[PDB]
RNA sequence: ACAUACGACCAUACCUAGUGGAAAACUCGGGAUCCCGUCCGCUCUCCCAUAGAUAAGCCACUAAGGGCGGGGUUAGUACUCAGGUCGGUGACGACUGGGGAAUCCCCCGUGUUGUAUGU
RNA sequence: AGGUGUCCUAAGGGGGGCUCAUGGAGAACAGAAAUCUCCAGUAGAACAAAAGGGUAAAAGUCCCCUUGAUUUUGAUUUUCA
RNA sequence: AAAGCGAAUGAUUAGGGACUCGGGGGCGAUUUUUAGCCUUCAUCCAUUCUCAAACUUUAAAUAUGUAAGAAGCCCUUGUUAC
């Protein structure tokens, strides 16, 4: 026998935290340093690049902070990557590079700097940053943005830096260092520059198929069921992604349509109202108490 | 209804409390390695009491944890010594249980006179599938009331699996 | 008897009840320009850039803007003369003031309201006036018959 | 209307117990060669999107629930600014011209909203 | 009613993972009190020193790297002429 | 100032319900590892009588900062090494 800690007085003194911290979706300590700007520059916006990983998707956005909420500049998902010739491994590391490149090309065309700032245009495993492009007898500074990684752990070779690498090659300038890229050896503090190239084009998953097939046939059949059905082999992986990159630059606004059922915007509203539940009125709630009294009284 | 509410062994953790530092403890840690095949971890005395003859920041105990099929096999060896009879008070309100044995060579390790004789303690943790919800870093939450194990359920599982008895 | 920098501020600098913890983040999204009217309110959580306890509650005018702080001008009353004071305050303590909004609202309405009359050709009587004594009116007692009152006798309650 | 990502006010949103969830989404889930990290692939990290299931998370509803928010009463009461050659041995109290609270107790309610994509 | 003539190469600076005091139920020697495991837990713990204020993916705790405890001078606040 | 303690810290009077293995003294053989029958303190829960210059969820009167424009409001567009 001891004090009941959770008594009526405990609730009264309780102070709840922020709603989005209760759900555990945001980190306000880090958020404050990302969005605040020097008061010398009055209304110059700060651009963030947020990346979130789900079970079967990758989400990328360009966000600017405002006093009454956030504003989204341009968004790119992994569903839209199907229209460019990729149908498998939608969440591997190489798929992050593709969707990272799509957003970078998508935003530059919005504000009319697509013709200049072409980028590398031939992917390579080299550590480079976008620089100013000379034009009209002058120098123009590149677009600048920063990376928001949320709550993901930033270890070496994580996919969060794949989107960073893809957008950097698009033409946007994003400051970073190379000590987190795959193929970086902490002992010699040097970057291989060849593992990176292989690891861009899906090489690591290609080696898995050939290695798994010889050692374990049945496991190789179960894990790669959908790869076999569309008879895509390890040798064909590199040319598949290389061709996808070409189509991204040619047309980034190609529309993709899914196989889910489709209706007009208004008809969906009517459908959801069928299954909604109506709150009980005060009169109905009062009437149940008398019914509860009568039946509870009769057992004893 | 019971589609995905079947109990299983989450982990088995077992410890030895030698109670005093020195070469004797090192021999005890030597014993525990071959039983599990993993290096064990020491523990330090956080109090400081003269009656028990221990001080702060001196190693006085060892322990190790195992998971998967290895935990299933090692638990079987321990229950053999207990001949599958446990007392009702060995099950906690959460749904876990444990016991202890006085002699560690009752099951064979090919006894050596140099190492000596030690007494070992047993404890295991039950669980249900999909308990990652309370331990993932992002969007951590609390499991529901209907999805947690009770004391009566786990003893029924123990009797049905090992055909043991409760006193 | 001692005089420290924070002496006597037991209740002034403390946060309220059920208000400890995280600072609302909309504070850092505001903007300031020279000539604005701001008022000072010290926040206990932030321990940098705290003005002296005298200025907790005064109102001033911005005169300088920097990376993370603003300069405010306030008037202090020493015995028999006034003195101009210039202080540096972090933005967590300052706040825009609604002191002048009534004036700025009234000047805008007057300009448009005078414009429409000049086209129409009628005097406006735009400037305000204090409350005037009431005017004559009539009150009917139909279905409102008065009720008579009287004082009550003494009685012991407890 | 509903779902997901980033938000604003920061309990009308929290805590306990019980029922239901079209579509998609979210989740649990399978494997440990490669990157990486542990006593232990528990967590973190990589690969797969087939299969199983809404059991849990999540959403909705119920309870003469605890708490929280708004209002009525207590009350023109307690207190207080100005005034008199006002009462009383004193303690202290009444009146004239003004300002004016707080518990116990009773009633109602249980989140609102901005940008982008999709059901 | 009390305090000061000190102390710190980290008890300063940056970054990352974790959450405290206490209570309930369990396990050979083990007992009020030694080590291990689960659930609840708004700070009831901690932060060199008197007291007051402040802090929960930290300002507490452990781990990794460091010397902004450096150079040249001006404006401003408190005691106040 | 007033107010509050069936609201946190601290002080304080009195009964009731639930409990025994927390301590003390008995009973049925002080049998007692009898959760037997008694009970005196202790503990927990719903109520009750009074307080705080160095306590507080709330909160006056009197006094206190700023503003009430021509040095104002609005439109168009020159300078720069920020």
- DSSP states of C89-151: EETTTEEE--TTHHHHHHHHHHHHHHHHHHHHT-----S--------------TT-------P
C16: the nucleotide nearest its CA (via C1') is: F57
Chain B 127-166 residues whose Cβ is under 7 Å from strand E = 134, 137-138, 140, 142
Tell me, letter by letter, the H, E, C secondary structure of B71-111: HHHHHHHHHHHCCCEECHHHECCCCCEEEEECCCCCCCCCC
Tokens of A56: 């079967």
A touches C, CB cut-off 8 Å, minimum 3 pairs: yes
First to last CA, chain C: 50
Tokens of A69: 């909420």
CB burial of C39-64 (b: ≥16 within 10 Å; e: otherwise) equals bbebeeeeeebbbeeebeebebebee
CA atoms within 13 A on the CB side of A2: 2
Residues C67 and C88: beta-carbon distance below 8 Å: no
Residues β-bridged to residue B121: B15, B100
The size of the A-C interface in CB pairs under 8 A is 41
CA-derived radius of gyration, chain B: 18
**Does residue A1 lie in a domain region?**
no
Closest CA to C38 of C107, C96, C81: C96
**Does residue A11 lie in a domain region?**
no
| H-helix or E-strand spanning residue B29 | helix B23-36
Distance CA C91, CA C28 (A): 7
Interface touch B138/A23, C-beta < 8 Å? no
- What Cα–Cα distance (Å) separates residue A243 from each residue in A84, A125, A201, A237? 9, 18, 11, 10
First to last CA, chain A: 33
List the domain range (segments joined by +) for residue A166.
19-296
Instruction: Check residue B118 and give left, alpha or beta (phi > 0: left; psi -120 to 50: alpha).
Output: beta
**Does residue A102 lie in a domain region?**
yes
First to last CA, chain B: 31
Interface touch B138/A24, C-beta < 8 Å? yes
Residues B123 and B14: beta-carbon distance below 8 Å: yes
Measured in angstroms, the resolution is 3.1
Give distance CA A299 / C1' D110 (Å).
34
Instruction: Check residue B23 and give left, alpha or beta (phi > 0: left; psi -120 to 50: alpha).
Output: alpha
Q: Please tell me the distance in Å from C65's CA to the nearest CA on chain A.
A: 7
Distance CA A210, CA A208 (A): 6
**Does residue A186 lie in a domain region?**
yes
Distance CA C66, CA A295 (A): 74
Distance CA A43, CA C29 (A): 10
CB burial of B138-159 (b: ≥16 within 10 Å; e: otherwise) equals eeeeeeeeeeebeeeebbeebe
Instruction: Say whether C8 sits in a helix, a strand or coil.
Output: coil
The phi, psi pair for C89, rounded to 5°, reads -130, 135
**Does residue A14 lie in a domain region?**
no
C103: the nucleotide nearest its CA (via C1') is: F68
- Locate the DSSP E strands across chain A: 47-53, 58-66, 69-76, 133-135, 138-140, 146-148, 184-185, 190-191
Chain C 80-99 residues whose Cβ is under 7 Å from strand E = 85-88
Residue count of chain C = 158
Closest CA to B151 of B120, B131, B124, B126: B126
Tokens of C72: 């405010």
Tokens of A135: 């034009």
Distance CA B165, CA C21 (A): 54
Tokens of A11: 């609730």
Interface touch A151/B140, C-beta < 8 Å? no
Instruction: Give the angle subtended at the CA of B153 by the CAs of B148 and B155, to the nearest 5°.
Output: 130
Q: Is A127 exposed, middle or buried (0-12, 13-18, 19+ CB in 10 A)?
A: middle
Number of separate domains in chain A: 1
Top residue of A26, A39, A67, A71 to mutate, by most chain C CBs within 10 Å, is A39
Instruction: Say whether A204 sits in a helix, a strand or coil.
Output: helix
The phi, psi pair for A249, rounded to 5°, reads -70, -35
- Give the β-pairing of B165-166 and B85-86: parallel
Interface touch A66/C91, C-beta < 8 Å? no
- Locate the DSSP E strands across A77-227: 133-135, 138-140, 146-148, 184-185, 190-191
The answer, for C67 touching chain A at a CB cutoff of 8 Å, is yes
- Give the β-pairing of A47-53 and B41-44: unpaired
Tokens of A108: 């530059």
Judging contacts by C-beta atoms under 8 Å, the chain C residues touching residue A38 are 67-68
- What Cα–Cα distance (Å) separates residue C61 from each residue in A27, C50, C76, C99? 35, 17, 14, 12
Distance CA A88, CA A265 (A): 31
Q: Please tell me the distance in Å from C115's CA to the nearest CA on chain A.
A: 34
**Does residue A106 lie in a domain region?**
yes
CB burial of A162-184 (b: ≥16 within 10 Å; e: otherwise) equals bbbbbbbbbbbbbeeebeebbbb
**Does residue A137 lie in a domain region?**
yes
Instruction: Say whether B167 sits in a helix, a strand or coil.
Output: coil
Residue C6 CB lies within 7 Å of the nucleic strand F = no
Judging contacts by C-beta atoms under 8 Å, the chain A residues touching residue B140 are 24
Distance CA C98, CA C77 (A): 24
Spell out the residues 6+ positions from residue B103 whose beta carbon is closer than 8 angstroms to its own: B117, B119
Spell out the residues 6+ positions from residue C32 whose beta carbon is closer than 8 angstroms to its own: A39, C38, C62, C65, C70, C91, C94, C96
Residues β-bridged to residue C62: C72
The phi, psi pair for C29, rounded to 5°, reads -95, 0
Residue C142 CB lies within 7 Å of the nucleic strand E = no
| H-helix or E-strand spanning residue B11 | strand B8-16
Closest CA to C40 of C30, C55, C61: C55
Q: Max alpha carbon distance in chain B (Å)? A: 57
Q: Is B28 exposed, middle or buried (0-12, 13-18, 19+ CB in 10 A)?
A: buried
B23-36 vs B69-81: helix axis angle to the nearest 10? 110
Residues β-bridged to residue A147: A49
Distance CA B129, CA B2 (A): 12
CA-derived radius of gyration, chain C: 27
Residues B88 and B71: beta-carbon distance below 8 Å: no
Residues B100 and B119: beta-carbon distance below 8 Å: yes
Closest-CA residue of A relative to B137 is: A151
Tokens of A152: 């993901």
The CATH number assigned to the domain holding A273 equals 3.30.420.100
The answer, for B133 touching chain A at a CB cutoff of 8 Å, is no
Residue count of chain B = 167
**Does residue A63 lie in a domain region?**
yes
């Amino acid at each position: 026998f001891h004090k009941l800690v959770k008594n009526s007085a405990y609730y009264s003194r309780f102070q709840t935290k922020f709603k989005r911290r209760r759900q555990g979706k945001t980190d306000y300590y880090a958020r404050k340093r990302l969005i605040t700007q020097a008061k010398n520059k009055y209304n110059a916006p700060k651009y963030r690049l947020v990346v979130r990983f789900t079970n079967r998707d990758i989400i990328t956005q360009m966000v600017t902070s405002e006093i009454n909420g956030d504003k989204i500049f341009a968004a790119a998902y992994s569903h839209e990557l199907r229209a460019y010739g990729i149908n498998h491994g939608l969440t591997n590391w190489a798929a992050a590079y593709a969707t990272g490149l799509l957003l970078a090309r998508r935003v530059l065309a919005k504000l009319g700097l697509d013709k200049t700032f072409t980028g590398v245009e031939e992917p390579n495993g080299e550590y480079t940053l976008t620089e100013a492009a000379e034009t009209e007898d002058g120098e123009r500074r590149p677009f600048k943005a920063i990376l928001d990684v949320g709550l993901a752990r930033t270890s070496t070779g994580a996919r969060v830096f794949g989107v960073m690498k893809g957008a950097s090659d698009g033409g946007i300038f994003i400051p970073h260092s190379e000590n987190r890229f795959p193929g970086y050896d902490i002992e010699t503090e040097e970057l291989d520059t060849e593992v990176l190239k292989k690891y861009i084009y899906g090489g690591h998953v290609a080696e898995y198929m050939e290695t798994l097939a010889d050692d374990d046939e049945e496991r190789y059949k179960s894990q790669f069921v959908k790869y076999i059905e569309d008879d895509v082999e390890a040798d064909s992986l590199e040319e598949l992604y290389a061709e996808a990159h070409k189509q991204i630059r040619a047309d980034p606004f190609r529309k993709y349509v899914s196989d889910a059922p489709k209706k007009s915007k208004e008809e969906w509203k009517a459908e959801s109202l069928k299954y909604k539940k109506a709150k009980l009125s005060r009169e109905e709630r009062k009437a149940r108490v008398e019914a509860k009294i009568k039946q509870l009284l009769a057992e004893q | 209804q019971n589609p995905m509410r079947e109990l299983r062994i989450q982990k088995l953790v077992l410890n030895i409390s030698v109670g005093e530092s020195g070469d004797r403890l090192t021999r005890a840690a030597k014993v525990l390695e071959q039983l599990s095949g993993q290096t064990p971890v020491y523990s330090k005395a956080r109090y400081t009491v003269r009656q028990f003859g221990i001080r702060r920041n001196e190693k006085i105990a060892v322990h190790v944890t195992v998971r998967g099929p290895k935990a299933e096999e090692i638990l079987e060896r321990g229950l053999k010594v207990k001949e599958y009879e446990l007392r009702r008070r060995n099950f906690s309100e959460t749904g876990n249980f444990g016991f202890g044995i006085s002699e560690h060579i009752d099951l064979g390790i090919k006894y050596d006179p140099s190492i000596g004789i030690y007494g070992m303690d047993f404890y295991c943790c039950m669980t249900r599938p999909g308990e990652r919800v309370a331990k993932r870093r992002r969007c951590k939450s609390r499991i529901g009331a209907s999805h947690r194990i009770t004391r009566e359920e786990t003893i029924r599982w123990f009797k049905q699996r090992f055909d043991g008895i409760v006193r | 008897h001692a005089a420290g920098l924070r002496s006597g501020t037991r209740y002034a600098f403390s946060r309220g009840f059920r208000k400890h913890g995280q600072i609302p983040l909309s504070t850092y999204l505001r903007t300031y320009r020279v000539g604005d009217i701001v008022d000072i309110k010290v926040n206990g959580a932030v321990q940098k850039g705290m003005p002296h306890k005298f200025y907790h509650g005064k109102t001033g005018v911005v005169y300088n803007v920097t990376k993370s702080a603003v300069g405010v001008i306030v008037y202090k009353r020493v015995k028999h003369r006034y003195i101009e004071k210039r202080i540096n305050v972090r933005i967590e303590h300052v706040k825009p003031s609604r002191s002048r909004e009534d004036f700025l609202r009234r000047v805008k309405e007057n300009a448009e309201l005078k414009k429409k009359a000049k086209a129409e050709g009628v005097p406006v009587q735009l400037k305000r006036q204090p409350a005037m004594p009431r005017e004559a009116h009539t009150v009917s007692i139909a279905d409102n018959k008065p009720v008579t009152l009287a004082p009550v006798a003494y009685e012991t309650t407890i």
